[PDB]
Amino acid sequence: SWKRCAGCGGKIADRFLLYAMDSYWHSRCLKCSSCQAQLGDIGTSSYTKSGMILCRNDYIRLFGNSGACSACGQSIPASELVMRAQGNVYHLKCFTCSTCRNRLVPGDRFHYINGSLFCEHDRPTALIGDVMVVGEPTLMGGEFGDEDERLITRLEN
Numbered sequence: 001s002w003k004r005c006a007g008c009g010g011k012i013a014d015r016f017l018l019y020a021m022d023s024y025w026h027s028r029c030l031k032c033s034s035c036q037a038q039l040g041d042i043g044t045s046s047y048t049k050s051g052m053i054l055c056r057n058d059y060i061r062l063f064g065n066s067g068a069c070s071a072c073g074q075s076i077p078a079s080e081l082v083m084r085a086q087g088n089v090y091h092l093k094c095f096t097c098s099t100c101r102n103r104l105v106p107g108d109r110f111h112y113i114n115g116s117l118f119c120e121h122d123r124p125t126a127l128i129g130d131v132m133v134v135g136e137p138t139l140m141g142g143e144f145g146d147e148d149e150r151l152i153t154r155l156e157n
């Protein structure tokens, strides 16, 4: 007999179907609670949390570690790339020299004194010393564990 779909309760007569969260699904019936994406096509897994079944992007958005920019004070979503210095995170466009206002980018030399960033050519001698190298941007949310991840298997009926 046909398997029943956990999404709609109907028999699955489709040639291709999904298995996830130890249920069978018509692919169209396995959708992100937030954005309605068809999980079996967009990616390889779903995330279960707080009664929802989510795509990776909405799992990150709703449950990932957001932060805040040390320069402007405003929130930074878990999905956003940030610059780092001295244990702080920054919007890319907030990561600027305090003297000349140039945006600092990976590989640039810079100084940091009490929260103020300075480019290589604006060494604040009067205030002063250590030269730092700007790292590549990284995701605000960083790495996260797979405890809520549930792989999707694409099957032929």
Ligand SMILES: [Zn+2]
Binding pocket: 005, 006, 007, 008, 009, 010, 025, 026, 029
């Ligand atoms: Zn269905």
Ligand SMILES: [Zn+2]
Binding pocket: 032, 033, 034, 035, 036, 037, 054, 055, 056, 057, 058
């Ligand atoms: Zn989604």
Ligand SMILES: [Zn+2]
Binding pocket: 069, 070, 071, 072, 073, 074, 090, 091, 094
């Ligand atoms: Zn900012």
Ligand SMILES: [Zn+2]
Binding pocket: 097, 098, 099, 100, 101, 102, 118, 119, 120, 121, 122
């Ligand atoms: Zn400068």
